[PDB]
Amino acid sequence: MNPIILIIILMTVMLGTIIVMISTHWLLIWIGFEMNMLAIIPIMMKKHNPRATEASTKYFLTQSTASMLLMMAIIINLMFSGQWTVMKLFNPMASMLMTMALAMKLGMAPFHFWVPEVTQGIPLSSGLILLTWQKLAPMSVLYQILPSINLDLILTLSILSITIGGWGGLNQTQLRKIMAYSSIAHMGWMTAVLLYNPTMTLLNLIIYIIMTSTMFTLFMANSTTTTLSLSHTWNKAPIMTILVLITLLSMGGLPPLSGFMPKWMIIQEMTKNDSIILPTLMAITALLNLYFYMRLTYSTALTMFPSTNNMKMKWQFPTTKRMTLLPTMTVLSTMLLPLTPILSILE
Template identity: 65%
Template sequence: MNPLTLSLVLMMMILGTLLVMTSSHWFMIWVGFEMNMLAIIPLLTKEHNPRSTEAATKYFLTQATASMLLLVAAIMNLLYSGHWTTMKLINPIASASMTMALTMKLGLAPFHLWVPEVTQGIPLMSGLILLTWQKLAPLSVLYMIMPSTNTNLLMIMSLASIAIGGWGGLNQTQLRKIMAYSSIAHMGWMISILTYNPTMTLLNLYLYIPMTATTFMLLMMNLTTTMNSLSLVSNKSPLITIIILTMMLSLGGLPPLTGFLPKWLIVQEMMKNSNILLPTIMTLLALLSLYFYTRIMYTTSLTMFPTTNNMKAKWQFKTPKKTTHLSPMIIISTLILPLSPIMTILD
């Protein structure tokens, strides 16, 4: 893609997201969502092949449907209350429609089917943007309308997302689909605590974005998209393989890595609110995600013959890509757990 065109598309995507996050007018929020959606389509079709075109079409249809539902809910609330402000979502039907539109944009269950299909058909860089940056705008709107949302509806969606995010990734061999199902499960954890403590949702988002971004950067550095190609990286660069597997376990929430921190604080916050059954079910469902991450670690590291075989291994050339930015990202994504007492005090 032309650098000028790429910079224009990225600027439009960032502008659309910032417009959504800073607006208190439903029409401007809808305009921001439309700008963001139309700007990311060229990034999804950066590689001109039928799979990327199909993925971009699925993404466009899903997001257009969600935007239409959002605008209908905003107009319904306008007719009921007489204003466009986001702080007073009075009509319960408009509130439920708005919640479904935003969860469809986030990829929560039962509107999750587009996430793995779109992520699988696009390049790794586009998948990184789709699973990190594209979550900011819908979550910011959900954060604003949180007092007006239906708590039971959000809880059902969050539990279904955690379950589907774990079950869906069990039999996958494509790393992009695994990351997509991981995103669905993480979104379920964020939404589950939204009604109890919205600040905890932001903390989970702040930790999810660097973990997912670091994992995608490591995959892009080695050009690995499947478990078979990941298993060959150990001959070329064993240290990178260990870091990738550590990142996978951190995404799964295994202590003492960073991914355990948001799950621990969310369960603790729910226990403070006398809710014991829900965090118990969520913790048990999180074991599914941890299982398929552990399966990746087993199949890529523990089943490899411990010698360099030139018939299987990639040529051991030095990578021309700069990796200076990866060091702080890896530290943030794996070693933040000792800061948990500070976060608990601040909370």
């Protein structure tokens, strides 16, 4: 791709997400999602193989269906409210359709069925965009429509996303599908605390984006897309094994790391609202996510799998890859729990 065209297309992705964030009219919300999808399609087809085209086709079908359900929810809102403010929804049918549409855009279960496919089909940088930046705009709309979100619907989507994203990654040897099922589980964690305290939703979103960006940046630095290729890292770059160790121990929610911070705070805002069964079941289901994180750390950092002879050649070439913000993200995704009361900046 032409780098000027790449810069314009990434600015158009960012522009569509910003247009979702800053607008007060529903047509501009729909326009931001249309612009975002229309611009992210070439980022998925960057390497031009049939897996990228299939992944872009599946992504187009799911996001187009979600955009049509979004516009139907907007039209029913204009029926039963006569106006266009991006605020609460004045019909439970429009509320249900918009919650379904945003669940399809996020990949929350049982609309999760496109996330491990598309993330497998596309490169690691486009999967990074899909799993970090493409979660911003539907969570912004869910932030602004939460006085009309049905409780049982959002909690059903949340626990179903947590359980299905937990049982997804246990069978996975491909790293991009591991990050995809981790995405489904963490989006369930974000939307479960949504109607109780959306500041903890924002905290979970920011910490998840930091940790996912750290893991994809390590995957791009080591050029590994499978577990068994990630296992060659100790013979090539031994510091990167320590980094994936501390980041995957962070993503499982193990204290004293920063990834313990969101879910604990989520429990801290759900036992206030006399929900005790639900954060307990969610926390116990997160042990599945931590189990396949531990599987990856066993394959990469805590043991030494056998490498091949040609690795001796790669000892003679240092990494010329622009590992952008990788020390910054690696520090922020691990050593941020003593700064837990910083979350009030999101209020």
